[PDB]
Design a protein around this ligand. Structure first.
Ligand SMILES: CN1CCN(c2cc(-c3ccncc3)cnn2)CC1
Length: 280
């Protein structure tokens, strides 16, 4: 699939940087014709077939195909796609209130209600994606951004669909590995992956939202990964002493090694607490 090959600078003006990653940079931008504001994600292309720098065309096309399908209040929307010899440029919905990661750092510890306010939105976005047989494969606080960080109950959107895959056969068996702290055991063990991996990541996020601590984090990536595979976590009383037993029950049903025994997204929404890269 080919994208628009006009110079993006003919149609948009760029401003402040919103994000920076291994093969991408994100710039705030403004469309000249409408005055509306977006986030332009510049993804570096591969220069050769055998190269390790940049993103393969297959991977870029996969991400764009997924983004084109999605429209939901808790997921990002894709506006347009440009390309040139060096980059594919995704013009995405602007989410200007920063990462949930940075919000959690700056704020004192969350209450269970503040945590569930966030978590219910995440669950709603993931329910949409999973209904579509889309696995995100990179859920973590850095990939959730707030629309406005200065309201009591911030609204969120899931971003960063660079690892997302359609799961039409119940699992996929590809080169898929996210951030060690957040990956499921089946990722660590290079086993076939499905929608269940996301549910593990939600359990890790939930743990962090309630405690400010990462459940599997070691001093090195390898130690983290070993901890994940062994399901080596516990609820430290220093952090969880005034956290409800039901909240812990929720996390325990997601941090399950066997993906078939893990709560699904639908189970998570009916749970009584809710119901109303890899190498150093
Ligand atoms: C781990 N990620 C990688 C780089 N970041 C981004 C940010 C955005 C974005 C989208 C809409 N409004 C603002 C920012 C899109 N893609 N990546 C954040 C941290």
């Amino acid at each position: 699939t080919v994208f628009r090959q006009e110079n993006v600078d003919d149609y948009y003006d760029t401003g402040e940087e919103l994000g920076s990653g291994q093969f991408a940079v994100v710039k705030k931008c403004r469309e000249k014709s409408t005055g509306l504001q977006y986030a332009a994600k510049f993804i570096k292309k591969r220069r050769t077939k055998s190269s390790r720098r940049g993103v393969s065309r297959e991977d870029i096309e996969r991400e764009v195909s997924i983004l084109k399908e999605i429209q939901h209040p808790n997921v990002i929307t894709l506006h347009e796609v440009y390309e040139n010899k060096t980059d594919v440029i995704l013009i995405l919905e602007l989410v200007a209130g920063g990462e949930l990661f940075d919000f959690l750092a700056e704020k004192e510890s969350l209450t269970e209600e503040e945590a569930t306010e966030f978590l219910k939105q995440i669950l709603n976005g993931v329910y949409y994606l999973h209904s579509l047989q889309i696995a995100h494969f990179d859920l973590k606080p850095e990939n959730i951004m707030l629309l406005d960080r200065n309201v009591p109950k911030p609204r969120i959107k899931i971003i960063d669909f660079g690892l997302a895959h359609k799961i039409d056969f119940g699992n996929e068996f590809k080169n898929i590995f996210g951030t060690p702290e957040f990956v499921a055991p089946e990722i660590v063990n290079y086993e076939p992956l499905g929608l269940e991996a996301d549910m593990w990541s939600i359990g890790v996020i939930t743990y962090i939202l309630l405690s400010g601590a990462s459940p599997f984090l070691g001093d090195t990536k390898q130690e983290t990964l070993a901890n994940v595979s062994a399901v080596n976590y516990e609820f430290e009383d220093e952090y969880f002493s005034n956290t409800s037993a039901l909240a812990k029950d929720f996390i325990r049903r997601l941090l399950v090694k066997d993906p078939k025994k893990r709560m699904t997204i639908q189970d998570s929404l009916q749970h009584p607490w809710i119901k109303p890269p890899q190498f150093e």
